[PDB]
Amino acid sequence: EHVIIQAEFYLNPDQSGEFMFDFDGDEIFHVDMAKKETVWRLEEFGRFASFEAQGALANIAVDKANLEIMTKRSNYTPITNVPPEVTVLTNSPVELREPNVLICFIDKFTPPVVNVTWLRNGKPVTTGVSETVFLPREDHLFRKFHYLPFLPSTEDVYDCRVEHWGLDEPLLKHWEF
Amino acid sequence: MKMRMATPLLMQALSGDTRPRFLWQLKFECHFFNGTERVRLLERCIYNQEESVRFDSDVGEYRAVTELGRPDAEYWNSQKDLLEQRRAAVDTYCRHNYGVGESFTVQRRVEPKVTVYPSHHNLLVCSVSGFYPGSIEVRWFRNGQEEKAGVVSTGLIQNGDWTFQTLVMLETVPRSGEVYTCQVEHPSVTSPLTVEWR
């Protein structure tokens, strides 16, 4: 048993679209809407497979048109914000001076708009961070991962700070060695 | 090989940010049983958080999920060429894409890295990291006997990067001569992986 999902959305009034494939919960690729480019989740995938990025843009255009029809058909009933639960964990057991990766897992939320900051000793860090696009859930909420590579030390602390319209305050998940 | 995409049908034509939002989601789900032996296509159309209309390859046509989805179900079902298009999609789309990606998805295998370390007296951690796929079994043994009591597990954690991990811990009152073993069973290896602690 396996499942492949082609998941798309359009969001108003942000005018944001996304287009991705999921295999058993993992992203295969997504399309960069700006660059009109196929972005394989693992680089090695692009060595075996290809995808015509331009087609996603045409799909998104149809989705946009349809969203506008349904918005008027619902007589402008808006989405209800569902705030995320957030978990911070490491990629591996933490050994001193063996490099590792902080994972910030953001789960069960909608609409698909968040602002995520990595904090180190209270300060924003951007060096080496990366993130995924918005990943689908059966209940039609979203998931998302952000990553922060780091060298373990007994004197650093970390925070993943997440903002979403359904939270009253920015959510802050702490981690330390 | 080139992955194929399915195309949503068009509906019928007639400091701060406190604006309301409107969300439209589209999902084409290809469900595979025993490779491509049995295949079901599920097209889900979702306004805000509510699925409103769907195509189910086992039904053969659109069905409204909510009253909101009703005119779409009827408009699209009135287009016979479109329906047989979607009906044939189980082959031209699902089976095709399964074939294109099979080698690096279905056949993907990464071996777990397994370690044991301390955290009544002693709590032991069996860390099992960076494996694929998710299907796995982690078992604790005290000497020769499997131990299921005093065990706490995180369960399967998906890392978001085509790897998984899991942590399984065992409460021990260690005694003389006791060997504790964490055993891992995973499709990547033919024999079990075992790690001993004393």
Domain A79-177 classification at class level: mainly beta
Q: Are A110 and A141 in contact (CB under 8 A)?
A: yes
SS3 content of chain A, % helix, strand, coil (to 5): 15, 45, 40
Q: Residue B42 CB: number of other CB atoms within 10 A?
A: 17
Size of interface A-B (CB pairs under 8 A): 189
What is d(CA B127, CA A91) in angstroms, rounded to the nearest whole number? 11
Whole-Å CA distances, B93 to A8, B6, B30, B89: 16, 7, 9, 5
What is d(CA B73, CA B99) in angstroms, rounded to the nearest whole number? 31
Tell whether residue B87 is among the known ligand binding residues.
no
Chain B nearest CA to A14, separation (Å): 8
What is d(CA A160, CA A107) in angstroms, rounded to the nearest whole number? 13
Using a 10 angstrom Cβ sphere, with 0-12 exposed, 13-18 middle and 19 or more buried, the burial of residue B179 is exposed
Partners of B127 on chain A (C-beta within 8 Å) are 92-93
Most B CBs within 10 Å, among A1, A3, A23, to test the B interface: A23
Whole-Å CA distances, A145 to A7, A86, B6: 17, 10, 26
What is d(CA B66, CA B187) in angstroms, rounded to the nearest whole number? 42
Please report, for chain B, how many H helices and E strands are present, in that order.
3, 13
Chain centroid, CA A156 distance in Å: 26
What is d(CA A4, CA A99) in angstroms, rounded to the nearest whole number? 33
Nearest CA in chain A to B162: A26
**Experimental resolution (Å):** 2.4
Q: Residue A169 CB: number of other CB atoms within 10 A?
A: 6
What are residue B83's phi and psi, to 5 degrees?
Answer: -65, -45
Q: Are A15 and B21 in contact (CB under 8 A)?
A: no
Partners of A4 on chain B (C-beta within 8 Å) are 29-30, 32, 94, 97-98, 101
Sign of CA dihedral B147, B148, B154, B157: positive
Chain centroid, CA B99 distance in Å: 19
Q: Which residues of A9-40 are buried (b: 16+ CB within 10 A; e: fewer)?
A: bbbbeeebbbbbbbbbbbbbbbbeeeeeebbb
Q: What is the 3-state secondary structure (H, E, C) of B117-138?
A: EECCCEEEEEEEEEEECCCCEE
Q: How far apart are the first and last CA of chain A?
A: 39
Chain B nearest CA to A139, separation (Å): 8
With CB atoms and an 8 Å threshold, state whether B104 touches A92.
no
Method of structure determination: X-ray
Looking at the DSSP bridge assignments, the partners of residue B24 are: A10, B47
Of B23, B31, B161, the CB nearest to A79: B23
Tell whether residue B56 is among the known ligand binding residues.
no
Nearest CA in chain B to A19: B26
Partners of B74 on chain A (C-beta within 8 Å) are none
Sign of CA dihedral B127, B133, B134, B136: negative
* DSSP state, residue B94: I
Chain centroid, CA B105 distance in Å: 12
Q: Report domain extents, chain A.
A: 1-78, 79-177
With CB atoms and an 8 Å threshold, state whether A1 touches B162.
no
What is d(CA B71, CA B47) in angstroms, rounded to the nearest whole number? 14
SS3 content of chain B, % helix, strand, coil (to 5): 20, 40, 40
Pull the structure tokens for residue B160: 């978001």
What is d(CA A3, CA B90) in angstroms, rounded to the nearest whole number? 13
With CB atoms and an 8 Å threshold, state whether A49 touches B130.
no
With CB atoms and an 8 Å threshold, state whether B2 touches A51.
yes
Selected residues 63-102 of chain B with any CB under 8 Å from a CB in chain A: 68, 71, 94, 97-98, 100-101
Pull the structure tokens for residue B105: 């998805």
Q: How far apart are the first and last CA of chain B?
A: 52
Tell whether residue B76 is among the known ligand binding residues.
yes
Among the CATH numbers 3.40.640.10, 3.30.70.640, 3.10.320.10, 3.90.550.10, which is that of B1-106?
A: 3.10.320.10
What are residue B144's phi and psi, to 5 degrees?
Answer: -90, -10
Chain A nearest CA to B86, separation (Å): 14
Using a 10 angstrom Cβ sphere, with 0-12 exposed, 13-18 middle and 19 or more buried, the burial of residue A111 is buried
Q: Report domain extents, chain B.
A: 1-106, 107-198
Domain A1-78 classification at class level: alpha beta
* Topology (CATH level 3) of domain B107-198: Immunoglobulin-like (2.60.40)
Pull the structure tokens for residue A67: 């969203």
Nearest CA in chain B to A64: B24
What is d(CA B101, CA A23) in angstroms, rounded to the nearest whole number? 10
Please name the residues in contact with A33: beta carbons below 8 A apart, sequence gap of 6 or more. Answer: A17, A18, A19, A56, A57, A60
Please report, for chain A, how many H helices and E strands are present, in that order.
1, 13
